[PDB]
Curated annotation (Swiss-Prot), chain A:
<protein>
    <recommendedName>
        <fullName>Large ribosomal subunit protein uL4</fullName>
    </recommendedName>
</protein>
<dbReference type="InterPro" id="IPR002136">
    <property type="entry name" value="Ribosomal_uL4"/>
</dbReference>
<dbReference type="InterPro" id="IPR013005">
    <property type="entry name" value="Ribosomal_uL4-like"/>
</dbReference>
<dbReference type="GO" id="GO:0006412">
    <property type="term" value="P:translation"/>
</dbReference>
<keyword id="KW-0687">Ribonucleoprotein</keyword>
From Swiss-Prot, chain C:
<dbReference type="InterPro" id="IPR018260">
    <property type="entry name" value="Ribosomal_uL22_CS"/>
</dbReference>
<keyword id="KW-0687">Ribonucleoprotein</keyword>
<dbReference type="GO" id="GO:0006412">
    <property type="term" value="P:translation"/>
</dbReference>
<comment type="similarity">
    <text>Belongs to the universal ribosomal protein uL22 family.</text>
</comment>
<comment type="subunit">
    <text>Part of the 50S ribosomal subunit. Contacts protein L32.</text>
</comment>
From Swiss-Prot, chain D:
<dbReference type="InterPro" id="IPR036164">
    <property type="entry name" value="bL21-like_sf"/>
</dbReference>
<protein>
    <recommendedName>
        <fullName>Large ribosomal subunit protein bL21</fullName>
    </recommendedName>
</protein>
<dbReference type="GO" id="GO:0005737">
    <property type="term" value="C:cytoplasm"/>
</dbReference>
<keyword id="KW-0687">Ribonucleoprotein</keyword>
<dbReference type="GO" id="GO:0006412">
    <property type="term" value="P:translation"/>
</dbReference>
UniProtKB/Swiss-Prot annotation, chain E:
<dbReference type="GO" id="GO:0003735">
    <property type="term" value="F:structural constituent of ribosome"/>
</dbReference>
<dbReference type="GO" id="GO:0000027">
    <property type="term" value="P:ribosomal large subunit assembly"/>
</dbReference>
<dbReference type="GO" id="GO:0006412">
    <property type="term" value="P:translation"/>
</dbReference>
<keyword id="KW-0694">RNA-binding</keyword>
<keyword id="KW-0689">Ribosomal protein</keyword>
Amino acid sequence: AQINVIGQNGGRTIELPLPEVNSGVLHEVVTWQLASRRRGTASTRTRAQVSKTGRKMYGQKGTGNARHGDRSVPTFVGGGVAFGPKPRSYDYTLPRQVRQLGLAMAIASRQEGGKLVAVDGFDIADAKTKNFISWAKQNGLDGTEKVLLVTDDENTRRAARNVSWVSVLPVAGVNVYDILRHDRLVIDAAALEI
Amino acid sequence: GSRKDRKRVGRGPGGTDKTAGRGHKGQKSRSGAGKGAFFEGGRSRLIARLPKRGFNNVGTTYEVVKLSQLQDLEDTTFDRDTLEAYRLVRRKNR
Amino acid sequence: FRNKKQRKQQVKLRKPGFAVAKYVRMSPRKVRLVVDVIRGKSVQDAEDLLRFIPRSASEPVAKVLNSAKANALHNDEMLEDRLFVKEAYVDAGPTLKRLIPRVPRARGSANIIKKRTSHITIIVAEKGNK
Amino acid sequence: IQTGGKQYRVSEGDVIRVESLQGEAGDKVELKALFVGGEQTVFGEDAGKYTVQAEVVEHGRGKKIYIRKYKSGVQYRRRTGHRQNFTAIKILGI
Amino acid sequence: PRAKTGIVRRRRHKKVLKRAKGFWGSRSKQYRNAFQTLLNAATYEYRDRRNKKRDFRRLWIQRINAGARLHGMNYSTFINGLKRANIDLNRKVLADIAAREPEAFKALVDASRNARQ
RNA sequence: GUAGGGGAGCGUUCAGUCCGCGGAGAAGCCAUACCGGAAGGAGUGGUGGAGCCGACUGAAGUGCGGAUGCCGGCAUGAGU
RNA sequence: AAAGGUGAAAAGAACCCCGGGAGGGGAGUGAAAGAGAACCUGAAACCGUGGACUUACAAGCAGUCAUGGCACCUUAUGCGUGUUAUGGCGUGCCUAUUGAAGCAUGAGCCGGCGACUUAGACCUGACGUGCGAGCUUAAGUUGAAAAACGGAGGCGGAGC
Ligand SMILES: [Mg+2]
Ligand SMILES: [Mg+2]
Ligand SMILES: [Mg+2]
Ligand SMILES: [Mg+2]
Ligand SMILES: [Mg+2]
Ligand SMILES: [Mg+2]
Ligand SMILES: [Mg+2]
Ligand SMILES: [Mg+2]
Ligand SMILES: [Mg+2]
């Protein structure tokens, strides 16, 4: 039930998720997402096998005050680790219903406050990066917020490059994380929208 | 906001650490610590000594299509040879 | 006062009557015996005793006593006729090793070690008690 | 004092276990047992005929005392903190 | 990722150690022996904490019948005659009444006498 | 109250957010009579000289007195 | 096998003093030498120096409680802190056990390392979430600051 910033109207479509903004599902979603991103890289020599050591030692019974088999065991120094990390995945598929329920619930979570849909990007005028600051100031972005821009038109994205103000998300490749992370979501391009 | 984002409220508990616990020394005192041999089944206890043969086959099996299902609801769309897949018999194979 | 590094740079940290023998190869436990008689009496006596004390540790203990008197008399502008050991004491040492006995838990057993342990230091002040 | 006053101890700030009614100097009174005051001595039940008065000074929490317990060879160590509450009452009365 | 034990053990240990003060020799200095001293120390702490009350009981009594006897009665006899009079629920710490204030304790004695014969 | 089962939590590394702090000085180390029901946590003071708390969430090589345990260091036997 | 660190910068210590030396004390450079080449921090065991209170008729798991002396007042003049004299009480820890102060195992002391884990379209249960008589995808394809697609198949749905 929402306005467009330039040109047309619409966005009175899109029934938002019920109840409005359930944060549990949100948490589930993002957690899944970071978990998807998580890259297992494990530098561990677990086994007494991994590290380099010859394996027969010295006398068993009869040396006294001793008791050992080998130098590669985890009770030794320099040896293997008992239960260290190995190269795993931890990537799964969260059920798709929730995969699409989430981002909707995010956009919904942007209805307690500011969000925006745009058309007519010609106010950018190539890139120049300056006219993006302008466009923002005229469209109400102090740049004291954090902003995510979702649009096509490479000319239009590439106007925005900076840490302070904004971040860019092409071709409606949107992330529940990315939009929930930033303060303002500029939904911009009305393609995936409406 | 991710930082104001809450938990599941009771999805998971924390795991189980047997390190510490001030007087945990785990499992069973003798006998059945350390082994990977536990193994609940096996021919030893009262499975063999039990007297059957018969023989295995399991031939043709059919989709069970409830009458109650067919009647009552829908249209009587005259099910026949194709539409039926959308009617939830879904098998193939049989 | 001001703050930390202010104090640090307005003040250079003197050490009146102080000198130290580092690393004299000898065992400090021994050297304490020599030192203990010196401590507390007038640096003259100290020089005498030390001349006449039969321990070999007496030797570098005398060598140091003078340097600390010598520091007192020159750097601190003190009075050698008010001079006495305010303090002396011995400890430490990076106890020596060549680690030539590579030890396979056997056949040489345990021997040697040669403590570097000396670190003899003495500190001189003026009596002025009278 | 088992709980609640007695005898004669006069013009003195002291402590008891918690006073029920809180206040800044909300008056609390006590019936007696003996009296060392008045430069005389006469026993009990003649002190039930007398009434001492006292004002409530502050409501306190005493000094923290740790509670440790241990049993040999069974494991079993127990650590718990304890602070027992009080009321400082000032005593001047008949 | 690993978590080295760093500064965790050391802290705990330092705390235990600090609990040990006028402890003789090894106890006050090296950890293990300190800690395990502190186990038996617990035992004596809590138990003597329940105890000192038995102790002070003993002391006070030991004074009370002392004074009683100075007057010609005893603890048995004194509390017998005192409590025989519904007069005195007096009881607690009364020892210092015998110790500090003699005339009073004398009156309590004579009271205990009138409550006998 | 022992094996055993159930409940609440403390502390440590990493990660994402949040809030911030630091050469008028970070963490770390040192002492300390305060706070908390415990794991523990602050206040200030001394060291240090380049970095780091707090909050929420997530992941662990995550908590030692023992194993004639491992590497190291330093004692006792002794000025024998 | 172990083995890393001055400082921003060599400005890495001319000169002077004690000493054959090693070593240190000044001067000087430097923000700092509370960085000096046995050069970041610098714990603990362990050895000393000085001080406070103490100890030479007392049978001691070293503590614990109670009181007195003495000394100290930065969370700190109080329910204090340190030390002590006397009284009462008081059979290390762990393990293994019918039973441990045990004249039964273990261990010199302090660091630091050191033990219930990971995996699979597995099996079963508890809690939580999404759809709900339906519920889901796998390989793979495509975008990849980002994820969608992919119904092969699997599980309910009928039993004997
Ligand atoms: Mg066992
Ligand atoms: Mg000889
Ligand atoms: Mg001998
Ligand atoms: Mg001999
Ligand atoms: Mg005080
Ligand atoms: Mg144990
Ligand atoms: Mg048993
Ligand atoms: Mg034994
Ligand atoms: Mg024995």
